[PDB]
Amino acid sequence: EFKVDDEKCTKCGICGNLCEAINVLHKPFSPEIGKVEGEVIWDEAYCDGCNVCAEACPSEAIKVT
Amino acid sequence: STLFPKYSKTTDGSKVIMEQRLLQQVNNLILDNDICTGCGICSEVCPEEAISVGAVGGVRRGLVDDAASIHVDETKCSYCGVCVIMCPFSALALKVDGEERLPILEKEGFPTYDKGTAIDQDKCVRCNICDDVCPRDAIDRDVPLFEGEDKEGLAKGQAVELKIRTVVGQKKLGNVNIIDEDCCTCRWCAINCPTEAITVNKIFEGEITFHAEKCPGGCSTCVDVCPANAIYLPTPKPAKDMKGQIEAKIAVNKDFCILCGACVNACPGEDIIYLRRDSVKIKGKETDLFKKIKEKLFTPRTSKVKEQPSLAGSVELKAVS
Amino acid sequence: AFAVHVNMERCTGCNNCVVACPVNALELNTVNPSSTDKIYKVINGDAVILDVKHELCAGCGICVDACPYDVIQLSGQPP
Amino acid sequence: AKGIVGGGCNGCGDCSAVCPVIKPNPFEMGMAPRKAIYIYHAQVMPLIYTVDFDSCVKCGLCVEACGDKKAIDLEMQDEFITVK
Ligand code: SF4
Ligand code: SF4
Ligand code: SF4
Ligand code: SF4
Ligand code: SF4
Numbered sequence: 001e002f003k004v005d006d007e008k009c010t011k012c013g014i015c016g017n018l019c020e021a022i023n024v025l026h027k028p029f030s031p032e033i034g035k036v037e038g039e040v041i042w043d044e045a046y047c048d049g050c051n052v053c054a055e056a057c058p059s060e061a062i063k064v065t
Numbered sequence: 066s067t068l069f070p071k072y073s074k075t076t077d078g079s080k081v082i083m084e085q086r087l088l089q090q091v092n093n094l095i096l097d098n099d100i101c102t103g104c105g106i107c108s109e110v111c112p113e114e115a116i117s118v119g120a121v122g123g124v125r126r127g128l129v130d131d132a133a134s135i136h137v138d139e140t141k142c143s144y145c146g147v148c149v150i151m152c153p154f155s156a157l158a159l160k161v162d163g164e165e166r167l168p169i170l171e172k173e174g175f176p177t178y179d180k181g182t183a184i185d186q187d188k189c190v191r192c193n194i195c196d197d198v199c200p201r202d203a204i205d206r207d208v209p210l211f212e213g214e215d216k217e218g219l220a221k222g223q224a225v226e227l228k229i230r231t232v233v234g235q236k237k238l239g240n241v242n243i244i245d246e247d248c249c250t251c252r253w254c255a256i257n258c259p260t261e262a263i264t265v266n267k268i269f270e271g272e273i274t275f276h277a278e279k280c281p282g283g284c285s286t287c288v289d290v291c292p293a294n295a296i297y298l299p300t301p302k303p304a305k306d307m308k309g310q311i312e313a314k315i316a317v318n319k320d321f322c323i324l325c326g327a328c329v330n331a332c333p334g335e336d337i338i339y340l341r342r343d344s345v346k347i348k349g350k351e352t353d354l355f356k357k358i359k360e361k362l363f364t365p366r367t368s369k370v371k372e373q374p375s376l377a378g379s380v381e382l383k384a385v386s
Numbered sequence: 387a388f389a390v391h392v393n394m395e396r397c398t399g400c401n402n403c404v405v406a407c408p409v410n411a412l413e414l415n416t417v418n419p420s421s422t423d424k425i426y427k428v429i430n431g432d433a434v435i436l437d438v439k440h441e442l443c444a445g446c447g448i449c450v451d452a453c454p455y456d457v458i459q460l461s462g463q464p465p
Numbered sequence: 466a467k468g469i470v471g472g473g474c475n476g477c478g479d480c481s482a483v484c485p486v487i488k489p490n491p492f493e494m495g496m497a498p499r500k501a502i503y504i505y506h507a508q509v510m511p512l513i514y515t516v517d518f519d520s521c522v523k524c525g526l527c528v529e530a531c532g533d534k535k536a537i538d539l540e541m542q543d544e545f546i547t548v549k
């Protein structure tokens with residue numbers, strides 16, 4: 001079902017702030033990289049076919065089914 | 066003698082309050098020791114040479130109790146308020162009677178820093194990155210809190226303007242700003258904003274260099290005290306990847322360094338760090354005093370071991386030619 | 387140029403204030419050592435501060451944070 | 466004598482109205498504030514408004530307030546005179 005495109009994701013919380021399934025962990029910010037980088041974790045136990053977060057993402061980084 | 070010029074220096078909790086009593090007129094230079102960062106841009110700028118810098122690393126780490134980052138001789142201070150205008154992270158305030166009052170600005174006798182902050186609300190998307198990466202607590206994002214971490218601000222389905230189908234255009238629920246008296250112009254939020262909607266310009270310009278080969282290892286005081294977290298300990302490589310290059314001991318990110326000076330004031334080394342500012346960015350016209358202050362801020366500096374004993378209790382740096 | 391005071395009565399000679407001081411670590415652990423003077427040396431089981439005239443300390447707090455049974459008080463105010 | 470025809474100090478008080486430094490007044494035994502540029506009291510005989518150089522921050526607001534009178538010279542030094 002769910003699939004993110006880490007190629008086009010900026011790790012903006014506006015995708016994990018909506019659903020209770022999407023929890024976005026920003027691993028600690030270090031000037032090493034100087035960038036934001038984390039992971040998007042989706043759990044089945046909370047989803048729906050709502051698909052709101054597909055278009056809530058600023059980018060098109062989320063396709064769900 | 067005479068008593069009524071009562072000079073007092075009280076440490077009321079976390080605020081060091083420096084005062085000058087009269088019958089009805091007071092003068093309160095109040096330093097908020099939770100926000101000071103140990104830079105000396107308050108000691109370099111003091112027209113009357115009263116503010117000195119103390120145990121920056123210890124105080125900024127919490128291991129010192131009987132002192133603040135800075136000591137102000139309130140008998141010498143003149144309550145001009147130049148330190149309050151020229152402190153990049155506003156951790157110094159002047160209260161004349163009982164109110165934060167700056168006569169020199171009221172008369173326009175001194176320029177102020179142009180941090181120039183702004184967030185084009187027609188481009189910001191209520192993301193959470195700018196509040197997350199901000200080294201200081203200076204992003205005031207006013208957004209209703211949806212099902213993420215709380216009860217719905219409106220509803221998961223009302224976070225997107227949906228007609229219940231297709232989305233109608235754009236959502237942008239709420240409003241995000243930058244507390245302009247707290248931003249230090251690090252640019253972590255502009256460099257990492259997803260939609261390039263943040264406009265901040267560094268107050269200082271110049272260059273800082275790190276001679277990694279002179280850091281004595283386990284001294285991450287510079288890392289601990291950097292306000293804009295520009296400094297890092299370069300992560301040791303794994304095996305089968307070292308490739309004969311061992312590692313650096315310390316380095317900096319010039320994209321985020323704001324040329325404050327806390328690193329130089331804190332390093333116990335000899336000349337690991339080289340700091341030199343070239344141009345401060347201001348609004349307000351100028352003054353002969355401001356030209357003197359520019360000349361004072363723009364002299365290159367570096368650490369020093371074994372400074373003179375007669376000034377024990379404070380910091381003295383090296384003048385670089 | 388601050389002043390450090392070591393409570394000799396509860397110092398155990400652990401030597402983790404000598405090893406952890408970044409001014410002590412300048413001699414052997416730096417490329418082209420600048421200054422080779424040392425704040426602490428454990429003589430007769432307790433840490434002695436050779437930095438009598440308070441010229442080399444930098445208020446780092448690496449030594450206060452290092453001692454296992456807090457015994458080093460760092461003074462951030464002029465002696 | 467120095468060439469300013471418009472004059473020197475007329476005791477208007479604009480300088481001390483704009484000075485931002487505030488210090489105790491030794492005439493009032495310290496009970497009262499006075500700016501860096503000041504007179505002890507309103508009945509001083511030379512009404513000429515000394516500048517307290519130990520406490521002045523050279524902000525230059527006083528000279529702008531004085532204006533064309535040009536009575537304020539912030540770089541003045543101790544002059545020595547010999548009298549028989
Ligand atoms: S899915 Fe979209 S909103 Fe969520 S983290 Fe990725 S880019 Fe940001
Ligand atoms: S599709 Fe709907 S329910 Fe599922 S994760 Fe996205 S927003 Fe949440
Ligand atoms: S200039 Fe630096 S040291 Fe001085 S008060 Fe401001 S933050 Fe603190
Ligand atoms: S108010 Fe003026 S004189 Fe007093 S400490 Fe600040 S800069 Fe120095
Ligand atoms: S990082 Fe940029 S887009 Fe995201 S909330 Fe901040 S200003 Fe808005």
Ligand code: SF4
Pocket residue numbers: 198199200201203204243247248249250251252253254255265
């Ligand atoms: S410039 Fe730095 S301190 Fe200012 S708002 Fe952005 S991240 Fe925060």
Ligand code: SF4
Pocket residue numbers: 273290291292293294295296317321322323324325326327328329
């Ligand atoms: S790296 Fe830049 S911001 Fe950080 S302490 Fe050094 S000069 Fe200040």
Ligand code: SF4
Pocket residue numbers: 279280281282283284285286287288315331332333334337338408
């Ligand atoms: S630069 Fe200074 S604070 Fe950083 S490791 Fe070297 S000596 Fe320690």
Ligand code: SF4
Pocket residue numbers: 333390406407408409410425442443444445446447448449450460
């Ligand atoms: S505060 Fe730092 S420099 Fe001073 S004695 Fe302790 S470890 Fe050494």
Ligand code: SF4
Pocket residue numbers: 392396397398399400401402403404428432433452453454455457458
């Ligand atoms: S670390 Fe503490 S206990 Fe050990 S020698 Fe130093 S002062 Fe004594």
Ligand code: SF4
Pocket residue numbers: 473474475476477478479480481513514530531534535536537
């Ligand atoms: S110095 Fe100038 S402004 Fe001040 S009282 Fe004299 S004439 Fe007026």
Ligand code: SF4
Pocket residue numbers: 483484485486500501502516520521522523524525526527528539
């Ligand atoms: S130059 Fe001196 S007397 Fe004139 S306004 Fe500034 S502080 Fe006051």
